[PDB]
Symmetry: D2
């Protein structure tokens, strides 16, 4: 016998006991008599528009594909839940953290980034780790990566970035000249660049990796007090990466490696877990931080801000229909229930917009009306109506303007966004030179040993080599700024690759 | 106080009862602490992106509109049932006729023909009478209208017709030349044109008008024997038209008069009803018939073809939410249960294609998933997946290829099309001159009496007059062919009309 | 020979006289043999899916309809130009007012608000007066209204407003209970509501109504020197409006009266024009202003803030294709070139989001490329790419990331937005009580004379009379808050109406 | 210096030199001041809605993606011309062949099949070969392949087939159980399934393979006589296939091998070319012939039906912008100028619908209006109007109904379709027994030599080595039904793989 994976269609007909098979039908529910031989005038004559069975199917077939994620197209998914094992109600008053043992059902999706839908899992790229919490207050999406930091700190340079990583407008090939001209001119990436070309670059599956909310957020307690926080949900399966070697063999032996490793893990019953933590920084402590507490290209050293365990993330159910439940999902950072709010983290401020923006496009206006995306542990109610493909509903014949004198939905002041005071002019404030080295240096010669320190200078040079020379220096320079040796090793290697 | 319609909100609230309102949430179900004031820095400062409340809402509002139906955009809808007051199971074996007494939930939408969503019901124009049956063998969309005949005999000239019947491409106004130039160049229109300007051109409210299927159809029984039939449903509310002045008045006082009439009649228990009948014709007779039995412009005389009583059509329910229940109601002439097949009606043949084609574009590739359209009385199982906005499970893990050896949906030798045998060179046979007078001449003389004739012409003469002298000639010319007098009688009015 | 609008097809045939007709082709360009009779196997047989002429033409016919603008569905559009005639450059460095005699192409559209596409023109309703300028610095849209004020003062209570106006979620009929229940609950509307029900609520055609910017905008000259402002452009054709009697008649007689009137004028050289002035309030003034200077329901009295002439708006070019030129026409208040900026007017701010947004839905992601919408007088060059229905050269090989060292477009540091200082807490400041009457009273008492006040209350009562009693009560109350006479004069009429 | 594909940007800057870079603007052409730092309230403050530079850019990015082709997603495309070399004026009256030395602009896209957009070029999968001839009679899309046969002879099966190749509905991974199950239960595949695993399964470069109109078509001369034919465009650069290990190496070393390879050729003057031939068969012969002369899994033998020469296919132009020219490219078999006509193929006929149809989905209603799809060597003129993103002018003010009396587009009898007399009942004729083994055996034996013969079994087994035995068996039952040793060798291999 094979693995639970391949034995899919197998484990399907079985459980289907001896119950006869459903009756093939058209979308209209008309029982199809013969769906193998099209209607034709004569055995060698043309086809009639009359074969609606055919028309009905081909028509549906011609419209399956929808736009793939603008980023993170390739990924895996599965559901499970979250459970409380610590009390942090002092910090946030969210319903998901209510009492201890408070298990909220979740939905998570792993994925790559730069590659398309046909791409393989096993390759150097950050990883998409987004959780969908279904809470009585509504849904809460923690759209996070496998790291607490990203490459850029101003949303505006993101589209340009994603481009710099994806194909060339003309050749449609991957273009290093682009990948590095951008990185080179934007040293802020330094930090997250180094993390990428580290060993973590390619985990073993989606399980032996770490999850983070990356950004800085804001918790609020039932007492109206607030404090900035950072979420870290480590892996209980342990950290594990794949040598550039395997990453390549796997790249072709099983392009969907990480994909079926997650399905079998849960099929065989070995459910992947993660222990959720959170750092904590008061506003007072925020004004003090030697750095921008809201800079996405920075971290809060654990020593100065220790981790507090909060919960256990347990994925235990495997998706049935992938399209409907995984590809069709929708993780929107904007979705945050009372007790949780965004920080003025310029990058975070960008996700507040983009996700619902695209979602409406990828899936359509009512993209939340999709089962997987619908917040069922809540009771959506308001003054919104219509839209294409309006399922449900449509919120019945209830009044549609606010305010109204007809007992239609009223607001709840208990969920008012926490009020903070901000002073200063309205201007395009430059964050470019917000120190893109320090924390980086203490990562090259403080977080990594000599072994991986080198594996880095090797990985990087192996790619940089392909970029125009003038580019290489503009890069070596920056790296150097993190530490001379850093740029020395790399540069060296390059020249050897440079013939 | 006033009418039930206008009392919509009232009642809704009284039913709502003492039940406290629902917490006003965002699309994501998150409660809103205050959906009346925006998040602005300062009481007179800028608006913030961070106001995902505003953006959430506003956004759905920006997508509230879907393209109105290409034709018959304005209308009203109601649900109810259908009863089997007779056993017509000798001709058609459709389960919707199974046994006397059986009932099948129906859905109907009345509509005008040309005017967009904002026009007025009380205007001369044919009328849409769609009857959707939710059977146990899929659905059945009998797209009827108040008239058994139409204007054209071949689809190809349909998109062209509707055009002439709408706004000039440059001015955007109703064009008399666009209208009459077309009607004059296509005599086959001579029939319905007459019926159109007659007293039936404006039926007083929906309840007071008949419904027809026009297209010759096919009824297959148990033995597989087949026949051609027509579908007529006479109104139990008796016929009632609206004088030009009484309608032309209601055009403003109440442009949605028809919509209100219906809702109101129902809301007051007074349900509109229709008896169903059909006309049966043998391939042999259809052979002998003096005309083309599938010529939409002609009718099967009562005498030669009496109407057999079928069952009843009760409208005892009003829509809850209009946009989700009526606006989206989609009727595809293709939905025919095993037992009702189309006919070689060149006109019908076209529709077979169009409805789903457009429904796939107005509502979406998965429109058959909309609650109203879904055949909730049968089990839809087939090999079609994905498509934007996939509701339900999408046949979960069930296979997707046919045939297959995994106990997936099967065939239905019983639901096989009937086998008719045609012959002749496959080409484009000009149907332009298949007697465009006979029946028109029988209408203008034996069906109408002098006062009814008088009207017809004045009605016609008053509209045709705005066309160019030349079209007027061409127009009158065709009328004389039906009958000398018809022509001159109208002509007369024109010369006067030309003051 | 009638009005130029009627003879549209005439002058066409005429226009291309000696020039022989072009060949009829499918979408693909292939020539069409016989476009009248579909390809049916046998003169009375089915329709071959092999017939492409049909399918091609039919499938397209099936997708002709796109959503109609969310609000202001029914309108009229013409193209003309703008000519500067006064140096106001000391207030805005906008390249549009650049210098005396300056000519900038414009495109305007007139509209109603609540009615859908079939809706009648001559009805009480504000009027849209959206201009589009194709300035050398990019398109500058100034979306004017036939009134310099609006009902609500916060963008959040807007979707609700429109809802109250349009059809009821259930019956689908206009609901006066809905309308007035709303206005009654938000007295800020008094001002505009009063204007609306005044003779000005039903202008005789588009040629007799002033256009306004309503919102306060911020102008910025060459020395980054700012100044708030109001946009006014009075008709040069004289203020004229249809009585309540002519309006109803026309309502059914000529639903497209505005269209017809506007088309004809131009068509016959009788070009309409508007002079554009602007009031100038300095930051120091907007400070001590007796009201919030960014409150859409208020106006800067001519007395303390004059009107400085700018130039003229002239329309002299009818649309050739309505759909392609007047329909797909989309204006974004967000489009403002260097020198013309927004104010903190909350009501305005929202608009910065919604117009481009909704457009991305109605017209489509790449709608900015639709001819009538492209800033043809400017040269786009950005890192934007792809999306459906992408024309032009998608900037071709051009680099796609920013910054880049490959000579792609750069940022002009001279068009950097002006910078203002705002301080305070950031939150939901409740601006529902910023005086909802003062100005209203001035309008009722000093702007209108008895003759007028008489029609107004009559008019208000005409509609309101139908709102449930408790609603009418609440309504008269407010009016009284403007003036005892106001509420009373109506009340009487009310009690009068109730038998 | 490196290859052309690598030096893409390098050249852009080079040639685009001696020119000040363009001004980076917005969608509306407004110059941006700084596109690197979003607008906020103070250095550490929230992002303002005011920032439109941001939104515009972001939203537009949030939509860059459109759905990929349901099949043949991964591909490379280029442009060239077709040159007549021989006179087959007698077989076709088609203008594209008018004379000797007649050039016609063509566009081409090569593509794998069951692989998603991100997949890798080199993999056992048929190659998509589609040429778009822009002729004076519009565009004639010759939607071919690198093989002259397919896996099934009935459209209906296609969706079911295609799904079998793609991913598993639940585990989303590629699944052999599905693969082989389909083929096992469907023997017609045999012929094409053999060719696949043959040495031709993985062609080296897109230039070292052939082209096969595949289907059977019809030809019509000026005198009206018709006949059937087979299209063949043999590679001039010669056939060069890739090994199995090599293929799987570039598979991850360079997954975009096709693109690069092909792009570089044309980039250096090494323009590839193909010779277009035609096999001819007269109706008479179409009668004598011995299995269905249209069976898509049957090829005419050069022996009895020889290869006639026609012309040259030369591709000497690379796309400037890929998304604009290749991604948006749309080839519709339904496009066919006079002289070329479909044939009964129960497979082809269906294609005539899937292509234009699925396009109205993937790209949009007016997709034929996208620059590369437009039939620019002709002149579209008809009665089709509107639809979203209506580019051009919608045809201006021309009359929109046919017929008309205003000199609008007329028709050409010259373009009438050939009339074939088809006799025989109208029903679903089984095609499962049309011989799916005779021709096949001839391959394995004749066309194939002992050497390659081995690499087939080895390959056909290397894959099937993952399908439940019960499946493996069924398969061997056919291969052997082809020829004893075929399944023999296979079965011998399979056993070892079964460890
Ligand atoms: C922030 C609140 C606003 C939002 C979200 C908003 C939204 C809309 C929407 C959805 C339409 C439909 C347009 C169409 O279908 O053609 C519209 C039309 C219009 N808006 Fe309002 N708008 C806002 C504020 C205003 C203000 C502040 C003005 C003052 C120019 C204005 C002027 C117009 C005009 C002129 C039209 C009609 C355009 C035409 O048909 O030519 N809007 N607006």
């Amino acid at each position: 016998n094979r693995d639970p994976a391949s034995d899919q269609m197998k484990h399907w007909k079985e459980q289907r006991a001896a119950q006869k098979p459903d009756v093939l039908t058209t979308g209209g529910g008309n029982p199809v008599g013969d769906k193998l031989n099209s209607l034709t005038v004569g055995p060698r004559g043309p086809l009639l528009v009359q074969d609606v069975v055919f028309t009905d199917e081909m028509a549906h077939f011609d419209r399956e594909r929808i736009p793939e994620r603008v980023v993170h197209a390739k990924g895996a998914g599965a559901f499970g839940y979250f459970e409380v094992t610590h009390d942090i109600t002092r910090y946030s008053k969210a319903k998901v953290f209510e009492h201890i043992g408070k298990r909220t059902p979740i939905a998570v999706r792993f994925s790559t980034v730069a590659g398309e839908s046909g791409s393989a899992d096993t390759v150097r790229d950050p990883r998409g780790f987004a959780v969908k919490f279904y809470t009585e207050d509504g849904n809460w999406d923690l759209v996070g990566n496998n790291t607490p930091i990203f490459f850029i700190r101003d949303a505006l340079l993101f589209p340009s970035f994603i481009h710099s990583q994806k194909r060339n407008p003309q050749t449609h090939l991957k273009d290093p000249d682009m990948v590095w001209d951008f990185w080179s001119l934007r040293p802020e990436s330094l930090h997250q660049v180094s993390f990428l070309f580290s060993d973590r670059g390619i985990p073993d599956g989606h399980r032996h990796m770490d999850g983070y909310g990356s950004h800085t957020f804001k918790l609020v307690n039932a007492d109206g007090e607030a404090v900035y926080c950072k979420f870290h949900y480590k892996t209980d399966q342990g950290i594990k990466n794949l040598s550039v070697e395997d990453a390549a063999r796997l790249a072709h032996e099983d392009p969907d490696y990480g994909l079926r490793d997650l399905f079998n893990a849960i099929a065989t019953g070995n459910y992947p877990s993660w222990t959720l933590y959170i750092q904590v920084m008061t506003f007072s402590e925020a004004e003090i931080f030697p750095f921008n507490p809201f800079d996405l290209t920075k971290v809060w050293p654990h020593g100065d801000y220790p981790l507090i365990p909060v919960g256990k993330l347990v994925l235990n159910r495997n998706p049935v229909n992938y399209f409907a439940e995984v590809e069709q999902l929708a993780f929107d950072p904007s979705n945050m229930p009372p007790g949780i709010e965004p920080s003025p983290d310029k990058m975070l401020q960008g996700r507040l917009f983009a996700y619902p923006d695209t979602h409406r496009h990828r899936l359509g206006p009512n993209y939340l009306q999709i089962p997987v995306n619908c917040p069922y542990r809540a009771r959506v109610a308001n003054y919104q109506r219509d839209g294409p493909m309006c399922m449900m509903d449509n919120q019945g014949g209830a009044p549609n303007y606010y305010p109204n004198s007809f007992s239609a939905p009223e607001h709840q002041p208990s969920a008012l966004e926490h009020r903070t005071h901000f002073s200063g002019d309205v201007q395009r404030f430059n964050s470019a030179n917000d120190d893109n080295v320090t924390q980086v240096r203490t990562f090259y010669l403080k977080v990594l040993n000599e072994e991986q320190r080198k594996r880095l200078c090797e990985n990087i040079a192996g790619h940089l080599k392909d970029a125009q020379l003038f580019i290489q220096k503009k890069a070596v320079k920056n790296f150097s700024d993190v530490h001379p040796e850093y740029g020395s090793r790399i540069q060296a290697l390059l020249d050897k690759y440079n013939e």
